[PDB]
Design a binder for this molecule. Sequence first.
Ligand code: HEA
Ligand code: HEA
Ligand SMILES: CCCCCCCCCCCCCCCCCC(=O)OC[C@H](COP(=O)([O-])OCC[N+](C)(C)C)OC(=O)CCCCCCCCCCCCCCCCC
Ligand SMILES: [Cu+2]
Ligand SMILES: [Zn+2]
Lengths: 196, 54, 111, 49, 495, 51, 157, 161, 165
Amino acid sequence: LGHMRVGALWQSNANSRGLPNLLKEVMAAEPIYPYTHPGLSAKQILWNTKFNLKLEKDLISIAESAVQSQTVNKVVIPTMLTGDVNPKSPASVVAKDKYQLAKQMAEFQYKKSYFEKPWGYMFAYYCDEDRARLCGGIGYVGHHGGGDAEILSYTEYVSTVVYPTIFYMAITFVVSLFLMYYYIYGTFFSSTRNRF
Amino acid sequence: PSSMAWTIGWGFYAAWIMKETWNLRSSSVGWTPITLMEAYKTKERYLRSKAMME
Amino acid sequence: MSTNKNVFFPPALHLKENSIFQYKFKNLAVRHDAARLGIILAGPTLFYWFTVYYFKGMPNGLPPVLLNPFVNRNYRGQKRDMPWGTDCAFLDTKCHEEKDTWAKRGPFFII
Amino acid sequence: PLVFDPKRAFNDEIFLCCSLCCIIFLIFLFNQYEEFAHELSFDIREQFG
Amino acid sequence: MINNIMHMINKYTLTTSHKIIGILYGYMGYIAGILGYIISMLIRMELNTQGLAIVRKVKEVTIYNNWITIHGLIMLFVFIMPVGIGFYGNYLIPMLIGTSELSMPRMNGISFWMLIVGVVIFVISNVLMSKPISSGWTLYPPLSTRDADNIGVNIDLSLLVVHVLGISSTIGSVNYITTNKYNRHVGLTFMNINIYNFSIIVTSILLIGSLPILGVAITGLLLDRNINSTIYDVIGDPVLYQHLFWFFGHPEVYVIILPVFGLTSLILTSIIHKDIFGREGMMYCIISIGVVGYFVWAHHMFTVGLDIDSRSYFSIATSIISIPTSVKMFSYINTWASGRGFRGNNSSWSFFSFLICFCFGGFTGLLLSSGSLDIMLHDTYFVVGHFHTVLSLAATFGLLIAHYFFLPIIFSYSIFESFSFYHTFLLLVGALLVFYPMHLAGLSGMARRVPEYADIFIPFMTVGFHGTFLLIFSTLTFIRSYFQFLSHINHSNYL
Amino acid sequence: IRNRLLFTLNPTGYTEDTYVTKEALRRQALAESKNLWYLPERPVVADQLET
Amino acid sequence: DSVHVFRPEFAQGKFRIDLDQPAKQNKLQQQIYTLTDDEREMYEDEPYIGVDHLYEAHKGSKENPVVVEAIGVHGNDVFTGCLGGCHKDAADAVAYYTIVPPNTLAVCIDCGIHFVARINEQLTFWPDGTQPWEKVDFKAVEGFLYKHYKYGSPLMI
Amino acid sequence: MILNTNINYGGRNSRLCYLIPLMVHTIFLYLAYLIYYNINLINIYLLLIIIIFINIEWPLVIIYEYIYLTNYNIQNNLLYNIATFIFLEILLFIGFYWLYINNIIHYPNNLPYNNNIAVNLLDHLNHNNNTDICLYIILHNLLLLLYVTLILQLVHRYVQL
Amino acid sequence: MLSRLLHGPGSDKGHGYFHPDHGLVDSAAQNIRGPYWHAENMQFMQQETAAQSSKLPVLSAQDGKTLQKIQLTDGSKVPKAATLVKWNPKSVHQWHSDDILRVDMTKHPEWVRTMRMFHGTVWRHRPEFRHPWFSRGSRASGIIMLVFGAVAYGEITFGKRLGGV
Ligand code: HEA
Ligand code: HEA
Ligand SMILES: CCCCCCCCCCCCCCCCCC(=O)OC[C@H](COP(=O)([O-])OCC[N+](C)(C)C)OC(=O)CCCCCCCCCCCCCCCCC
Ligand SMILES: [Cu+2]
Ligand SMILES: [Zn+2]
């Protein structure tokens, strides 16, 4: 029977490889709490966790008691079309006045400095790493593409590459027809020469 | 075509089968005198030819 | 919950006819199929035997066909070895008896 | 227990129809075999035959 | 251990898994191809030399005739259909439509082992028995039936081999059609399936319609030989036999070629990183070629004495079938443009050679379509040049594209590109030196199926000699490359 | 060889790897019940040639 | 007057699974069709319904993703896909497939769409005629589910 | 509890993957041996017994797979395959009719006998009449087969309703 | 019509597929919600429960109340004391009612054969293995055919038919 497995817990096989933990891959052998809880030691972190846990318990109890023992003065039933499972979301994601524009601009600047450039650099590294993985004779890296490739849109390509090519093909067609007829028969419109 | 068309077609097929049955039997009966006459004629011709050759 | 209930104890349904048969012969498709069957039974079959009765004591005077003449008795010198050895047609039972054709029997098994 | 029931078998339409069709097919086979041997003059070694 | 041996045998004999049956089909197809190539080398050595250098007798030319007939049959029925259709058809068809197995799983195993019994009977009859069949792959009577050199049971066993091969192909065709029709994942419409799947479907439709007629023809041959009937003798119609055979015959060649088109399109989509140009057009052209191929069969019979109006009709129909193939060629040429195909890839260069050689073969075969001009080119080496620059230079290179593409995916090892380049380039050059001259030898008047030729045809056969040496080099390189593919390193040191 | 022929006479019967004799059952039963006085015995160990 | 009893369909297994819950199984095996060329032309010039699309969050946002459900084994990667052209710059010739871990937020950076392919296992009662005909409670189901989670169960193949 | 897979019939390994090919091989070698030595290597009844016994596996597996593995997708596949098989049989009959009628549609023919008119009373119907073809019995058999077709269609529809 | 000949909607492309008038009926609907195309000319009968079968091997998996709720009938002659309930189309629940009379189709040979395939035999993944001796015969036949083929090849090639030695 060999080494039969015991239980049926998850194993990384061909059908499943799991969801990678990038945080542990990057922060390997380095603590995370100096970034998530700056300036605190382990005992302070534990004490803070305990204090906040008790406070959260109290607040949750208060909220549940409130919601479960309040008198109903109004009933709100949203309007939806028949056959529709859920009502449409009443929240819009587009700024309407200029103050909302300024608020979203400040948010965008922060996000750019702190959430978008990190994504860009991570993706650039991922692309280069895929290249390195496929390099060295394993895959077809460097066989085509690169940064010197000339990428053209559909309109540019058809207008500047396809039509001139077909034009040259047509001219070649006519010229070859005439030259081949002359070569074989020795005339242009009279079939064989010295015969008719 | 509907079911009525198919019933009509089956009726026509039955009529054709009946026609063929009757025609076959009547023709088989009707060729007996002709075949007998042909046999007698060829028998007579054979005997006459043998007599002449002898 | 499962449909197996109606498989184990299917409902019983009430008819106004003495049997399903009668009830099932009110559909026009079944009626037309029965009509076709009756057409074939009535017309051709009863007529066939009628002709058999009408010409029971009369000859079949159709002239015989002419297959192979006397001068072509050798079939132009063509080989005529059947796969069963002799030179007899498969269903010419009488001709087989004049050429055995069955003395060369094999074994029941490979040996 | 699983026991064959001739009563139910004979009170079933599919059993009757298939048996009748098999019988008619056997009759047809025997009749066609009877015309291949003792009816015809031409064998399988001819042009039309 | 007995348990391990029985497990292996049962794994490869009781299987009904499409992947396993696909690899079995591929292996058998490659082996049959190699055997046919060896026989072809014997043929070429007979042709390359003067004075019957190999057979040494005029009474023994039946050996050469056996060679040509078995070469034709092996290469057509046992090499290119098991590889083109059986191998990638079973392996890929369920995968591309997102299903588990083909419908009728058992019939797949039945099909493969029917192929195997056919190969076994054929090899035992034509190798281990004396005086085999010597009538070309087109088993024309009365040569096949009424002939002194064809009396043994080897001929009958070969005919029954043709029967079993037909049975296997029919089973495969039915299975492919049924699986593609009903087993597509939700959201995949019939005409959006992969182009290879559609080509397999049309090939299957071709095989279903025509094989029973070939079965009838071969049974006629068997009955003539054994029951001593005159179906095709002097009181018969050898032309009837030819009509039936060729009603099967041309659908067979289009069956051979269409899956190569499907595979080439699929692999192109994979290796150029761009979709097919005019996918709908290519699919419709495939189905059009499939349908039109059923109305042209008698273009192989322009000299048997057809009616003049029938000759005109068959030339017309051949032109009609020419049209959609041109559409497909233009679609391929435009597909390759604006792509990013790998520039050091045996698949890319094999595609180039496939395209060029197929265009050349199509043109040469379009010359043969005209009835009148077929008076001067029937049963010459022009026809051999045609159907070898098609079969042995386009269909073969399509299978080489598939081979150099799917090996890293089936086995998980890369491909030795330089080695494979040597193989492919020498295969191209060596074949072009053997087959191209045949064309100009056909026009000059050389007849086919002859081991000895007049002194006027020396240069063509000298060029053929050169080509045969190059072909030997190329095929040895190929087999050695594959052996090296599955072998670990043999030298290693410290630098 | 003969052993293979012994268990194939009953196609629905056990095989060599799943057949247990009465003595083997008794030994397994003694082993399972952790009797103090059951002194386990060593199976006959064979070298290469014997096998 | 007579009594008739229609002959029931006795088949079990896959057939009885299909006939117990025809909505779910039909959903699994119901073919849906895509637009032809003229239909694509007729669809591309249809109008939006209201000005909501100018304000709301589209279907496929980081907060309103496209959640899809497959059947399989827990933890097995899910096969999903587009029909192409969710964006102007994305290909549309043929369907494009994807292999993604289950129960995770994935983003297609071809079109820009966030999706939640996830797996629901089709655990069903052993179809041998012992299925329950009336409402069942959580006890027996609790035992079966515990055994399946800890050890696994056979496949209906 | 069981885990439910796709609707597709996954498939089972079987011995029919090689038994049917071996049966074909046996039949063809039997024919070859009968051709060579004009005798039977194995009794024909024994051969037919082997052939019948090999093919009893189909109904058994069919029963046990219908009881357990069947749904509408599988049924549609099976019915489409049945249709294709019927089509193949039709094509086989077409090929054999082609074989038969090839020399009959072509009216002119070189005959051993005379078929011109005004030479004998019966010559003018020699080529266009094979007057031994058992027409009466053929019509009787036709009636039998019409019986079978109509009865079977009636019963099929009746049970289907 | 080609469309109707090839089992399509027909002339009207918005039309359904089933035509129960000429035998093209819906098996799924019949099995799940009964043949509602016979609804106008058939009626359920309403008033021996199924509890007598509560101890059988396959019906013991059900609760006692479930079998008590089911009422049985001989299934041959109309119970003269039983009222008639109209069969209502478009109602998916009337086929599952417990108030209507039913018939115990558990002694049907097909029922017994199915449950035996599930409850009366050891489960084999291969139906051919479900019959042990037949599988033995089949593998023996395979070996016999192999031997026959080998012997025939040997005899035909060498010209000696093994009967003289
Ligand atoms: C698919 C069919 C096929 C293939 C591949 C070939 C391959 C070759 N054939 Fe032929 N041939 C026929 C089909 C084929 N042939 C037919 C039908 C006839 C007519 C028979 C008749 O006339 O009666 C014929 C007849 C024929 C003749 C007739 C001679 C005569 O009639 O006078 C000659 C001689 O020159 C010839 C030569 C060759 C050569 C030199 C090769 C090759 O050596 C050249 C290319 C070599 C290859 C390398 C292909 C082999 C591939 C393998 C190595 C397997 C590996 C797999 C792949 C590479 C994917 N062939
Ligand atoms: C897979 C193999 C294969 C393929 C694809 C073909 C394709 C074609 N074949 Fe042939 N053929 C054979 C395999 C094949 N053949 C074999 C094995 C034999 C010999 C059988 C035997 O006798 O032994 C044979 C024999 C054969 C003959 C017999 C000659 C003779 O026996 O007398 C003829 C003649 O009609 C013929 C014609 C054609 C034509 C017209 C095509 C067309 O499909 C080709 C059309 C392709 C194009 C035309 C190219 C596209 C062109 C353009 C890019 C545009 C140009 C268009 C215009 C000018 C309008 N083939
Ligand atoms: C003898 C001539 C070549 C005969 C072989 C022709 C192949 C026939 C088709 C079937 C293929 C079968 C297998 C093929 C095996 C390998 C064939 C082979 O030799 O391929 C390599 C040959 C020769 O390649 P190459 O010599 O150009 O390679 C040098 C290029 N780099 C920089 C990468 C080292 O293939 C081709 O050249 C085909 C593509 C033609 C495009 C020409 C571009 C020139 C290269 C860039 C230089 C700088 C700009 C110059 C300006 C452009 C003006 C010309
Ligand atoms: Cu052709
Ligand atoms: Zn997308």
